[PDB]
Design a protein around this ligand. Structure first.
Ligand SMILES: CC(=O)NC1(C(=O)N[C@H](C(=O)N2C[C@H](O)C[C@H]2C(=O)NCc2ccc(-c3scnc3C)cc2)C(C)(C)C)CC1
Lengths: 87, 104, 141
């Protein structure tokens, strides 16, 4: 299986499936196997990775869909990341 | 049934899934393909508890309704350098700032 | 363009709310005006009387966020076979991460304060441009 490494501004290294990371057109362009994000800290990028897993699992599925949870304290930063990543 | 995991050591975090019926040892083979260290140089943990190779992830408390895609369960990881194993160390994620006033 | 047909052929329907939101059903009348109907609490169901060729869509009653019905945007009652009703299963879509972040930020900040947020102008416009049925009717056309 092909994995890629996404690195947060504080040096946390997140290893995810390549297919999952291609959810983002921005990440695809940065690849085309490691990407550094200078403006995205780990408490945000970890959530981004969890969104990829959630999306791939529940897209085109029958089983009832649960809400994607976002704590108030990270919502503003997560919004800015999602805008940059187009996801 | 699929379980969704974060496998964590120091500042490394791997997102992956596995079967509830799969074994601890089989999860080490997954880590081996990604980080290039064999099973005999790996220890896996749930919180502070060392996991035995022969046990299933289900037996050890990773079940499909607690290890969810949007909220995966954590498995700790320690490597052996030379003769002995390092202690389990997982660096915490960064802290969010204060909520702005207009969000209170 | 998008409007119910006046067929007068009865059709019984179960509205089943399999979402965690409060649900607003909306009937598109014979001139295409949206007409709101009583809400459904999370997890609950109602047996209602509608007609063949009538158009319905479903929204979050508090925010107007978009919801799906049998995996799509619009629901049209069909012919009942053997007296059994048609099921309208109402669910959350998989929202984009951006739209979900906008939902959460909208639920915490009063509209007058969107401009005090420290973000690019385009995201302030994205917040202000909140979900709305008329907007989506124009899109669907
Ligand atoms: C008299 C007449 O015009 N009959 C016809 C018709 O189309 N009637 C419409 C009608 O009865 N409709 C339109 C929609 O198909 C639904 C249906 C109606 O109003 N059914 C009653 C009803 C009441 C409550 C609810 C709901 S929705 C959530 N909770 C409830 C209880 C659903 C349906 C209406 C023009 C009177 C609004 C021509 C066949």
């Amino acid at each position: 299986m092909m994995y890629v490494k996404l690195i947060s501004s504080d040096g946390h290294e997140f290893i995810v499936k390549r297919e999952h990371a291609l959810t983002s057109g921005t990440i695809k362009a940065m690849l085309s196997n490691e990407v550094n994000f200078r403006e995205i800290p780990s408490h945000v990028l970890s959530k981004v990775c969890m969104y990829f897993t959630y999306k791939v699992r529940y897209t085109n599925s029958s089983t009832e869909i649960p809400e994607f949870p976002i704590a108030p304290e990270i919502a503003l930063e997560l919004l800015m990341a999602a805008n940059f990543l187009d996801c | 049934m699929d379980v969704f995991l974060m496998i964590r050591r120091h500042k490394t975090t791997i997102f992956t899934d596995a079967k509830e019926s799969s074994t601890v040892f089989e999860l080490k083979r997954i880590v081996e393909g990604i980080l290039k260290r064999p099973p005999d140089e790996q220890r896996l943990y749930k919180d502070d508890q060392l996991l035995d190779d022969g046990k299933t992830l289900g037996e050890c408390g990773f079940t499909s309704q607690t290890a969810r895609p949007q909220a995966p369960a954590t498995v700790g990881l320690a490597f052996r350098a030379d003769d002995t194993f390092e202690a389990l160390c997982i660096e915490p994620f960064s802290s969010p700032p204060e909520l702005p006033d207009v969000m209170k | 363009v998008l409007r119910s047909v006046n067929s007068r052929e009865p059709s019984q329907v179960i509205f089943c709310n399999r979402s965690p939101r409060v649900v607003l059903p909306v009937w598109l009348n014979f001139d295409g005006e949206p007409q709101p109907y009583p809400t459904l609490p999370p997890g609950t169901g109602r047996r209602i009387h509608s007609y063949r060729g009538h158009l319905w869509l479903f929204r979050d009653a508090g925010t107007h966020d978009g919801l799906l019905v049998n995996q799509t945007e619009l629901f049209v009652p069909s012919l009942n076979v053997d007296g059994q009703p048609i099921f309208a299963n109402i669910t959350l879509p998989v929202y984009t991460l951006k739209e979900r972040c906008l939902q959460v930020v909208r639920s915490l900040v009063k509209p007058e304060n969107y401009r005090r947020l420290d973000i690019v102008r385009s995201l302030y416009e994205d917040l202000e441009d909140h979900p709305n049925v008329q907007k989506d009717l124009e899109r669907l056309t």
